[PDB]
């Protein structure tokens, strides 16, 4: 019944799960507070190496701290996009280090004025991950695109079958946990994002 579930694997992956499936995990203060507390806990636990972020049920996070605070963590966040990824849900996914998506999962850059203007929000991350052209197209049209188009556009690293989504996100996450030390991951995130988050 908690808004956000928290689970740690033996391999040192914190699994963070949006748990309001009845509303396709639409953003809200319960979901926010669960998310922050869950992230803080993974971030503070030296036994945790990598974070996996996902939504329970049919949707990832469909509509409704700075927007990009995930980019300033010492630890990587892997989004496993199980279904509808819309509005603030797209913004949060794109703030993550790496994204896997289930085949058929729907994306839409649909926003109210407040999301469009928000500093370090979608109008910041989207063109940085893709380009002005992609960002203009997706924002002005508000159109729906699927996991496969998202991958073509570079919004997603890899599309897998729905059944294989979590095994793959977890495989990859323990893979990087073995390959990089904790201070190497922190260095990488800080080096890649750079001066740009400040």
Which stretches of the chain bind a copy of itself, using CB under 8 A?
Answer: 76, 97-99, 113, 116-117, 123, 126-137, 139-142, 154-155, 157, 172, 175-176, 179-180, 183-185, 187-189, 191-194
- Site membership for Cl ion, residue 184 (CB under 5 A): yes
- Site membership for K ion, residue 131 (CB under 5 A): no
Which residue, 127 or 182, has its beta carbon nearer to K ion?
182
Q: DSSP assignment, residue 154?
A: T
The residue with its CB nearest to Cl ion is 184
Closest by alpha carbon to 156, among 105, 98, 70, 85?
98
Which of the choices K ion, a copy of itself, Cl ion, none does residue 76 contact, using the CB cut-off of 5 to 8 A by kind?
Answer: a copy of itself
Strand ranges (DSSP E) for 68-153?
77-81, 85-86, 98-102, 106-108, 144-146
Q: DSSP assignment, residue 55?
A: E
For residues 14 and 50, the answer to whether their CB atoms sit within 8 Å is yes
Q: Which stretch binds Cl ion (CB under 5 A): 48-56, 62-70, 155-163, 176-184?
A: 176-184
Which residue, 33 or 187, has its beta carbon nearer to a copy of itself?
187
For residues 53 and 81, the answer to whether their CB atoms sit within 8 Å is no
- Site membership for Cl ion, residue 141 (CB under 5 A): no
For residues 59 and 25, the answer to whether their CB atoms sit within 8 Å is yes
Q: How far is the CB of 182 from K ion (least distance, A)?
A: 8
Q: How far is the CB of 48 from a copy of itself (least distance, A)?
A: 15
Q: Rounded CA gap, 8 and 11, in Å? A: 8
Look-up of token digits 């503070």: 44
Q: Which stretch binds K ion (CB under 5 A): 75-83, 132-140, 155-163, 175-183?
A: 175-183
Which of the choices K ion, Cl ion, a copy of itself, none does residue 175 contact, using the CB cut-off of 5 to 8 A by kind?
Answer: a copy of itself
Q: DSSP assignment, residue 57?
A: T
For the four alpha carbons of 123, 194, 29 and 88, in that order, the dihedral sign comes to positive
The residue with its CB nearest to K ion is 181
Backbone angles phi, psi at 78, to 5 degrees: -105, 115
- Site membership for K ion, residue 152 (CB under 5 A): no
Q: Which residues lie near K ion (CB under 5 A)?
A: 181
């Amino acid at each position: 019944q908690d808004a956000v579930l928290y689970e740690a694997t033996p391999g040192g992956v914190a699994i963070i799960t949006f748990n309001r499936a009845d509303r396709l995990n639409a953003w809200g203060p319960d979901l926010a507070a669960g998310f922050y507390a869950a992230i803080d806990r993974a971030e503070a636990d030296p036994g945790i190496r990598v974070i996996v972020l996902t939504g329970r049920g049919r949707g990832f996070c469909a509509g409704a701290r700075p927007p990009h605070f995930v980019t300033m963590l010492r630890k990587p966040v892997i989004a496993a996009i199980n279904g509808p990824c819309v509005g603030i849900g797209l913004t949060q996914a794109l703030m993550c280090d790496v994204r896997f998506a289930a085949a058929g999962a729907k994306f839409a850059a649909v926003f109210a004025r407040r999301g469009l203007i928000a500093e370090f929000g979608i109008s910041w991350i989207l063109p940085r991950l893709t380009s002005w052209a992609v960002a203009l197209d997706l924002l002005l049209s508000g159109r729906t695109f699927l996991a496969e188009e998202a991958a073509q556009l570079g919004l997603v690293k890899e599309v897998v079958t729905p059944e294989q989504l979590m095994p793959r996100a977890l495989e990859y996450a323990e893979d990087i946990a073995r390959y990089c030390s904790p201070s190497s991951m922190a260095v990488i995130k800080r080096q890649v994002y750079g001066d740009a988050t400040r």
